[PDB]
Curated annotation (Swiss-Prot), chain B:
Component of the mitochondrial small ribosomal subunit (mt-SSU). Mature N.crassa 74S mitochondrial ribosomes consist of a small (37S) and a large (54S) subunit. The 37S small subunit contains a 16S ribosomal RNA (16S mt-rRNA) and 32 different proteins. The 54S large subunit contains a 23S rRNA (23S mt-rRNA) and 42 different proteins. This is Small ribosomal subunit protein mS26. It is found in: Mitochondrion. Belongs to the mitochondrion-specific ribosomal protein mS26 family. The chain holds residues 212 to 316 of 316 of the full protein. Signal peptide: none annotated. Transmembrane segments: none annotated. Component of the mitochondrial ribosome (mitoribosome), a dedicated translation machinery responsible for the synthesis of mitochondrial genome-encoded proteins, including at least some of the essential transmembrane subunits of the mitochondrial respiratory chain. The mitoribosomes are attached to the mitochondrial inner membrane and translation products are cotranslationally integrated into the membrane. It comes from the Eukaryota.
From Swiss-Prot, chain D:
It comes from Neurospora crassa (strain ATCC 24698 / 74-OR23-1A / CBS 708.71 / DSM 1257 / FGSC 987). This is Small ribosomal subunit protein mS23. Component of the mitochondrial ribosome (mitoribosome), a dedicated translation machinery responsible for the synthesis of mitochondrial genome-encoded proteins, including at least some of the essential transmembrane subunits of the mitochondrial respiratory chain. The mitoribosomes are attached to the mitochondrial inner membrane and translation products are cotranslationally integrated into the membrane. The gene is rsm25. Belongs to the mitochondrion-specific ribosomal protein mS23 family. It is found in: Mitochondrion. It comes from the Eukaryota. Component of the mitochondrial small ribosomal subunit (mt-SSU). Mature N.crassa 74S mitochondrial ribosomes consist of a small (37S) and a large (54S) subunit. The 37S small subunit contains a 16S ribosomal RNA (16S mt-rRNA) and 32 different proteins. The 54S large subunit contains a 23S rRNA (23S mt-rRNA) and 42 different proteins.
RNA sequence: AAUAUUUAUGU
RNA sequence: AUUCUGUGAUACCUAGGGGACGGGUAAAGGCGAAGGCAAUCUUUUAUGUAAAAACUGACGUCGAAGGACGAAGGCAAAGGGAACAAAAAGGAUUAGAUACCCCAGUAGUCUUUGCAGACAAUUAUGAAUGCCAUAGGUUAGAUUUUUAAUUUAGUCUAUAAA
């Protein structure tokens, strides 16, 4: 799809930087039991997208 | 700058394909977990044996045209949020 | 859906028969009479009411002819203005 | 007042047309033989 | 429960009327020739009318006007008998069976491409 | 630099004819009749007039004189010109009394136009500097945006799905770069409001290190962002968190030019009886009776649903000229589609007789003859 | 009491001649009540705005919808002309190929509407059955 | 490339559905594909009663599978199905226009909505 | 259905039922109107003999022009009376 | 509305 | 009339097998050098069209011959064979009837591999370039105050100068 490694990785990094679970502006009200949960959840969700997209954008899965 | 614009458009698609990768199936674990959850005999309101019983009919033209002429009726608030979100995602590009 | 075409140049713009032909109303009443005979009999009682209707027809006088329609005159006026023009 | 004069003309047309349709139904139905 | 069927097959040169039971098994399978109409006399409109009246009359002898609560009329082909038998089933003869009719269908056989037909004729 | 002949044409009366405005927008996803078309909601062409000295000659200031058969005899001369010269070398025109006299009828009711408010019937006129304004400036806030009536952006709920995609790919997408600047100007204030008090105890608005710092903080609160996106795209408010945003903004000014009165808070002083309580009643038609549900009534050419309440219940061919009932027009307003919706309420009894007195149709006069 | 219904038997008759659906705001003149305007001379209930463009769907990518394919074929299973559909020549070709795709793929009948659609429409009780005959 | 398959297996047994969906599913993932969604439609009437593998069927168990795999896998996926004696028929179709923008809006198989592209 | 399956055949689509608001005689009218709109009688006539592609193509061009000419003629006949009403 | 027997000759 | 049918036909069904054909959509519509190409999924293939920029920098047009492609019919080999149908044969019509019409029917039409190269293979008009005034439709795009108007490349009617 007229993509390359640079454009691909940059889109992944950008896509992850804008969906990172925003931490609360303050630290006293924020407790980890939920913050770290989003981190582990996001990190696990990010790895899934990278594994899926790499296969979709693979040029070996294209046509003539 | 013209080639950059095309790259940005090429990026938004990858960003949209990134958000929609939550429901994909990349490993056999997710596949088996998905099949065993959905391919159950007593799934279609069971009683019904088909999607038709659970969800009467697939959307038709009569139902599509009635969504903009017959009603205009409170789903406007249910839809506008679907469009306001889309507008914000386009301008900001942050996938709200 | 495309719109109607602009007629090509014709020798004359006109309708073949301007006045609608009015089917003799009593050929329809005869068709009904012929129906009773087939279903029942030629010489029966159920045909009396329909046969009389057929007799009432031919006794009634023919209506007067309707006035001639002036459609062809107005078509000849707007021929060159409506179509591509006139030929010949 | 103008709407009254026009509405009346429609009442006549509807009355005339309504008669034609019902009369057509009588002729449409087969009453060729009365038993 | 499927209703009875009153197939009316009609073409340019003959007319067939079959009255079947819900399982689509013929009970009265007659044609214009069964009434004595010979080679060319079996294409006329009046010939098909008498056939319909004969079949309807034969149905009464079999006590089918009190045995068929639901019936279907199937029309095949566009011959003269297509309109003749209808007026029989819509006139005084079919006054008993008219109320039992629940469906009206057309079963004219068409082919999407299909096999090649005969070459056109040069009559002149 | 303009030639003398061209300077006269520019100021010519024929050149002042406005372009045909688009017809009242109807439901795109719906069937319509092909050939026969009735009167439109509001006029799309200009109604023309002449002197009675020239009308006898068919002169209407057009390309050619119009026929005397179809333009002479009537009282009010009105004509609409679809084309000054068509492919048939004729002026395709038509009578203009359908809309020309409907305006005079409505203006004879002496009722202003009010702002629609969901259901204390407080009526506020349209012609008010508080609301009737189109110009604005960047200092405008969202609170003031609820008072305007003319937004340059479309209504999302009203746009069809296809139209919405074109809007995103032709107006919203190419405005990405400009929108970032819009935030820079806003963040120039985000820095300086930290100096809200620095003097009592703006920067140059270019910081790529900041515009990204802000929007990422608004992903948890989508409401505040939508309000910020509407200002840049000039979108009429949709969610309550006011100016009747349910059905959408008006595609026209709220009055629509039909009537410029501001209030009906007057008491027409009757000659004999004196100041009346209500306004003079108006006889209305009955169309589409209840017993296709609901009732319609023709009130001064406009079609409005019958009063909240018989002739309306069923159709009676016995009445001459149709079922006609007297009624009073309470409130009138313009719909987002451009229509004129009248909230009509049945009238009283004595007022109808008071009106018939002047007209003379009152069988029993109320003056003198009335003993009690 | 039949005298009442006898009166309504004529009311619906007259109302059937009112070939017009009055709406709120629709301006009407004394001429809109004449027979010429009430006759409804319009001989076509055409569709407007090219619903395909308005709804912004790709038909070819919606070959699964059994109701969408049955909406663009006559009860006999024949694709509808551009007059009835009221679509542009481009969208007509896209929807025509969508109907031919589903039928050719073997997921939709070619001579009638989908069986599951014939159930919910009228005639469900009288739908032709297949007697086992055995 | 983004494909989509509509398998119509015999009715009566749900096991024959899982094993077939998993056989094709595991096949796509091992090759290197990505399954996007698998909707489980039930058992409803076929377009017409057809005969396949010494059996006369009137209604099959439908199921749609939307995946993104290679051409060699696609051909191998729909060749295993056609070879399996439990499928009444299959309907494979390529999705989209081949462009990234249209290919980024294909999610779950819709029933009450359209694939707006 | 559950107990007895539906007979799915070409005649199924060409079927019209009798209801409270539709009599047997009325079901025939709807049948003839639908059978005439789908041109069943025409196709039966065109399938009796073979028509090679060239002849079929040239036959369509002749029939397709007589429909446009007729449609464009009706537009000029009605456009003539619309101008007559204006007085032109 | 899709009908269809046969008609050679003339310094 | 020949012919089919009591060895149970036609007609109405059920269950299997087998071949080629391509209904609607469909249009003055589109696609290829032409011949020609119309059900469907997947795979595969060279041009062409629109708008923007970028790039190469005359690298272009025509083209004897050679080579390649070339409809239907036909030859050759191996398959297929429902339907249609030269031939051959039979029944009618007719003054006679090889014929036009009819009951039937073999090559052949279809698949694969070659030969063959002739067509009203036509726009009765070789290809290509520059240039000349308008109008009404229509096909695929583009632009716009996308309602309706401009605009590029095709095609088709009716005209001006000629
Ligand atoms: K027989
Ligand atoms: K150079
Ligand atoms: Mg032969
Ligand atoms: Mg002869
Ligand atoms: Mg001589
Ligand atoms: Mg047998
Ligand atoms: Mg086969
Ligand atoms: Mg050719
Ligand atoms: Mg076709
Ligand atoms: Mg080309
Ligand atoms: Mg060359
Ligand atoms: Mg050469
Ligand atoms: Mg050959
Ligand atoms: Mg050969
Ligand atoms: Mg051989
Ligand atoms: Mg011979
Ligand atoms: Mg012979
Ligand atoms: Mg043969
Ligand atoms: Mg060769
Ligand atoms: Mg040459
Ligand atoms: Mg052109
Ligand atoms: Mg062409
Ligand atoms: Mg020319």
């Amino acid at each position: 799809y007229l993509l390359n490694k640079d454009e691909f990785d940059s889109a992944i990094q950008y896509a992850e930087h804008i969906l990172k679970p925003i931490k609360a502006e303050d630290r006293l009200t924020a407790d980890p039991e939920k913050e770290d949960e989003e981190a582990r959840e996001h990190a696990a969700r990010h790895a899934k997208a990278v594994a899926a997209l790499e296969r979709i954008a693979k040029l070996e899965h294209g046509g003539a | 700058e013209k080639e950059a614009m095309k790259s940005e458009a090429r990026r938004d698609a990858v960003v949209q394909l990134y958000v929609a990768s939550k429901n994909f199936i990349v490993d056999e674990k997710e596949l088996e977990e998905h099949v065993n959850k959905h391919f159950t005999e007593k799934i279609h309101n069971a009683s019904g044996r088909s999607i038709w019983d659970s969800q009467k009919n697939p959307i038709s033209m009569r139902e599509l045209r009635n969504e903009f002429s017959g009603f205009n009726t409170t789903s406007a608030a249910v839809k506008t949020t679907v469009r306001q979100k889309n507008v914000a995602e386009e301008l900001t590009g942050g996938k709200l | 859906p495309n719109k109607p075409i602009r007629l090509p140049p014709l020798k004359q713009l006109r309708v073949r028969q301007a006045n609608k032909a009015e089917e003799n109303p009593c050929i329809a009443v005869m068709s009904s009479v012929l129906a009773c005979w087939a279903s029942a009999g030629y010489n029966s009682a159920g045909c009396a009411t329909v046969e009389n209707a057929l007799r009432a027809c031919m006794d009634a006088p023919k209506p007067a002819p309707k006035p001639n329609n002036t459609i062809n005159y107005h078509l000849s006026r707007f021929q060159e203005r409506l179509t591509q023009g006139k030929s010949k | 007042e103008l709407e009254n004069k026009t509405y009346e003309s429609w009442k006549k047309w509807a009355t005339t047309e309504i008669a034609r349709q019902e009369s057509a139904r009588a002729s449409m139905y087969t009453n060729v033989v009365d038993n | 429960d499927e209703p009875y069927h009153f197939h009316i097959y009609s073409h340019k040169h003959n007319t067939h009327i079959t009255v079947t039971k819900p399982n689509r098994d013929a009970l009265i399978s007659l044609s214009c020739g069964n009434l004595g109409f010979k080679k060319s006399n079996r294409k006329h409109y009046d010939s098909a009318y008498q056939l319909g009246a004969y079949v309807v009359d034969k149905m009464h002898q079999m006590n089918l006007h009190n045995k068929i609560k639901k019936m279907e009329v199937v029309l095949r082909g566009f011959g003269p008998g297509r309109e003749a038998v209808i007026k029989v089933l819509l006139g005084n003869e079919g006054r008993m069976l008219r109320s039992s009719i629940v469906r009206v269908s057309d079963a004219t056989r068409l082919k999407f491409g299909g096999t090649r037909s005969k070459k056109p004729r040069r009559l002149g | 630099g303009v030639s003398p002949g061209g300077a006269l044409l520019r100021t010519s009366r024929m050149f002042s004819l406005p372009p045909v405005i688009p017809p009242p927008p109807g439901n795109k996803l719906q069937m319509i009749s092909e050939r026969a078309s009735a009167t439109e909601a509001y006029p799309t062409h200009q109604v023309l007039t002449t002197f009675e000295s020239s009308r006898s000659r068919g002169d209407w200031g057009l390309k050619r004189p119009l026929p005397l058969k179809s333009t002479t005899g009537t009282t009010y001369p009105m004509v609409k010109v679809k084309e000054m010269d068509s492919l048939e070398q004729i002026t395709d025109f038509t009578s203009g009394t359908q809309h020309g006299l409907t305006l005079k009828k409505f203006q004879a009711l002496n009722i202003p136009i009010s702002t629609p408010s969901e259901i204390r019937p407080v009526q506020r006129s349209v012609f008010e500097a508080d609301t009737d304004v189109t110009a604005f400036s960047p200092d405008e806030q969202i609170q003031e945006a609820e008072k305007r009536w003319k937004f340059s952006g479309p209504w999302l709920a009203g746009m069809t799905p296809g139209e919405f995609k074109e809007y995103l790919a032709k107006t919203v997408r190419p405005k990405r770069a400009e929108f970032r600047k819009f935030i820079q100007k806003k963040i120039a204030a985000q820095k300086t409001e930290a100096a809200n008090r620095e003097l009592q105890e703006k920067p140059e608005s270019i910081t790529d290190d900041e515009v990204t710092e802000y929007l990422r903080r608004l992903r948890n609160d989508n409401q505040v962002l939508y309000d910020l996106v509407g200002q840049f795209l000039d979108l009429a408010p949709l969610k309550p968190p006011s100016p009747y945003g349910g059905r959408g903004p008006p595609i026209t000014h709220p009055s629509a030019g039909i009537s410029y009165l501001r209030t009906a808070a007057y008491l027409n002083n009757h000659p004999i009886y004196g100041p009346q309580k209500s306004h003079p009643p108006v006889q209305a038609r009955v169309l589409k009776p209840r017993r296709g549900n609901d009732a319609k009534i023709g009130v001064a050419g406009f079609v409005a649903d019958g009063p909240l309440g018989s002739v309306m219940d069923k159709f009676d061919p016995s009445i001459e000229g149709g079922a006609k009932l007297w009624v009073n027009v309470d409130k009138a307003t313009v719909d987002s589609t451009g229509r004129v919706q009248l909230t009509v309420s049945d009238a009283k009894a004595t007022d109808v007789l008071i009106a018939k007195e002047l007209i003379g149709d009152a069988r029993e006069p109320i003056f003198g003859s009335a003993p009690k | 009491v039949q005298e009442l219904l006898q009166s309504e038997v004529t009311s619906n008759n007259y109302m059937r001649m009112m070939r017009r659906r009055w709406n709120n705001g629709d301006v009407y003149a004394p001429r809109d009540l004449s027979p010429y305007e009430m006759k409804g001379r319009n001989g076509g209930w055409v569709e407007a705005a090219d619903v395909v463009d308005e709804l912004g769907f790709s038909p070819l990518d919606n070959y699964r919808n059994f109701s969408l394919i049955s909406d663009y074929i006559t009860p006999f299973g024949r694709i509808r002309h551009s007059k009835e559909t009221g679509l542009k020549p481009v969208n007509q070709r896209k929807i025509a190929k969508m109907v031919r795709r589903a039928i050719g793929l073997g997921i939709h009948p070619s001579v009638h509407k989908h069986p599951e659609i014939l159930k919910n429409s009228n005639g469900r009780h009288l739908l032709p059955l297949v007697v086992p005959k055995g | 490339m983004l494909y989509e398959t509509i398998g119509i297996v015999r009715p009566g047994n749900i096991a024959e559905v899982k094993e077939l969906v998993l056989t094709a599913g595991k096949l796509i993932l091992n090759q290197g594909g990505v399954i996007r969604d698998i909707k489980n439609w039930g058992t409803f009437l076929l377009p017409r009663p057809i005969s396949t593998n010494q059996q006369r069927h009137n209604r099959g168990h439908y199921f749609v599978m939307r995946y993104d795999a290679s051409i060699a896998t696609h051909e191998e996926v729909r060749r295993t199905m056609k070879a399996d004696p439990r499928v009444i028929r299959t309907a494979n179709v390529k999705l989209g226009d081949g462009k990234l923008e249209t290919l980024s809006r294909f999610g779950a198989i819709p029933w009450r909505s359209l694939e707006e592209a | 259905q559950q107990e007895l399956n539906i007979r799915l055949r070409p005649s199924t689509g060409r079927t019209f039922y009798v209801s409270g608001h539709q009599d047997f005689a009325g079901a025939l009218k709807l049948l003839h109107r639908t059978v005439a709109a789908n041109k069943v009688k025409k196709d039966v006539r065109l399938q009796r003999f073979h028509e090679r592609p060239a002849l079929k193509r040239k036959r369509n061009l002749r029939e397709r022009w007589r429909a446009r000419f007729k449609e464009g003629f009706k537009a000029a006949v009605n456009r003539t009376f619309e101008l007559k009403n204006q007085g032109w």
